[PDB]
Write a protein that binds this ligand. Structure first.
Ligand SMILES: [Ca+2]
Ligand SMILES: [Ca+2]
Ligand SMILES: [Ca+2]
Ligand SMILES: [Ca+2]
Ligand SMILES: [Ca+2]
Ligand SMILES: [Zn+2]
Length: 361
């Protein structure tokens, strides 16, 4: 969907409607904690909207915004694996719950907004069909069409109250990651079907009208559902990581904005377990890694699929010179996420020169 850097446009409408919908649908028996957290959410509507649009304007975005795409119908032992729209929902959702728990509500809500940007995208027709703006003139055309008419596509209810099926189903599965993937898959498959049936360049103005109606309604309802899940999760301190093989680790790395803080050297993330086994991956995204001021995400798939988070005793990042000279690197902060939970939040704010290793854990 379209969005503007000031937190306006289709994406902002979707999150804004998401909140209104939830407000309308909230049953009387909902816990006080949920209502209290919803009011805090509403205090930070600006952030939610800005977050819902930001990934399109992130200076660090990948070349063809690959991570804004996801096909719902779809070597890793030593290299990071790329993010997808689905995986970014999970990443930002984890960051959001983490910040919420420590009362850092403005930043928490921004992250929630970013999670919803990606959900919004996988609920378009073009993104889950994996048809890019390069592939088809229809990509930009359809999103512009929707943007112009976004007002007439707003909805204000999911169609039932939160003590009913749609919403109760959302709370059933304590495994947020597993729930999010399949929940997102449903909406994405609908969007993709709508691409082929109504939204592609083969179709009419009437077809595009129906396509936008259904996918914008679904985007809003789907967003309301994620917000509901979020308010419940943060109200109860629900941990979806318990607990639970660590099949993947995600690193979320903030590079300092200081001069020459970024690097083009080889960069590795590694772990050592209590049993002294090691695994190390090169961090390399389909993009310009470790740019000054950037926030980079890397996902690492473990060789041992039966490890528990406690089993991981040491973590580090290691740099290796690309040229004969040291390209010193200065990370501000690294967060490691496992199974939907931020398990490491490590301020660094010091230089890593040459071929040095920095010990996180
Ligand atoms: Ca540097
Ligand atoms: Ca320089
Ligand atoms: Ca490389
Ligand atoms: Ca790269
Ligand atoms: Ca660079
Ligand atoms: Zn979009």
């Amino acid at each position: 969907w379209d969005g503007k850097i000031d937190g306006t446009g289709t994406h902002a409408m979707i999150v804004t409607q998401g909140v209104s919908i939830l407000e309308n649908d909230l049953s009387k028996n909902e816990p006080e904690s949920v209502r209290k957290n919803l009011e805090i959410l509403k205090e930070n509507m600006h952030e939610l909207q800005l977050g819902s649009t930001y990934p399109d304007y992130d200076k660090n975005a990948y070349d063809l915004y690959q991570d804004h795409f996801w096909d719902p119908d779809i070597w890793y032992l030593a290299y990071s694996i790329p993010d997808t729209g689905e995986s970014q929902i999970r990443k930002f959702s984890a960051l959001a719950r983490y910040e919420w728990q420590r009362g850092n509500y403005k930043q928490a809500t921004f992250y929630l907004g970013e999670a919803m940007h990606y959900f919004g995208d996988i609920d378009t027709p073009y993104h889950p069909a994996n048809v890019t703006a390069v592939d088809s003139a229809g990509h930009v055309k359809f999103e512009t069409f929707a943007e112009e008419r976004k007002e007439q596509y707003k909805i204000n209810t999911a169609g039932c109250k939160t003590n009913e099926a749609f919403y109760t189903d959302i709370l059933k599965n304590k495994d947020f990651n597993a729930w999010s993937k399949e929940y997102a898959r449903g909406f994405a498959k609908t969007g993709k079907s709508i691409y082929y049936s109504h939204a592609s360049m083969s179709h009419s103005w009437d077809d595009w009208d129906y396509a936008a109606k259904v996918t914008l309604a679904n985007s809003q309802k789907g967003t309301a559902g994620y917000i509901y899940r979020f308010l419940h999760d943060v109200s109860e301190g629900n941990d979806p990581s318990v607990g639970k093989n660590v099949k993947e680790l995600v690193a979320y790395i903030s590079t300092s904005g200081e001069k020459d803080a970024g690097t083009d050297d080889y960069m590795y993330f590694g772990i050592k377990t209590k049993d002294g086994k090691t695994q190390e991956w090169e961090m390399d995204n389909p993009g310009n890694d470790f740019m000054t001021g950037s926030k980079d995400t890397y996902t690492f798939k473990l060789k041992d699929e039966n490890l528990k988070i406690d089993d991981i005793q040491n973590m580090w990042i290691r740099k290796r010179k690309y040229t004969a000279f040291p390209d010193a690197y200065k990370p501000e902060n690294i967060k490691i996420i496992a199974n939907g939970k931020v398990v490491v939040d490590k301020d660094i704010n010091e230089w890593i020169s040459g071929n040095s290793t920095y010990n996180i854990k």
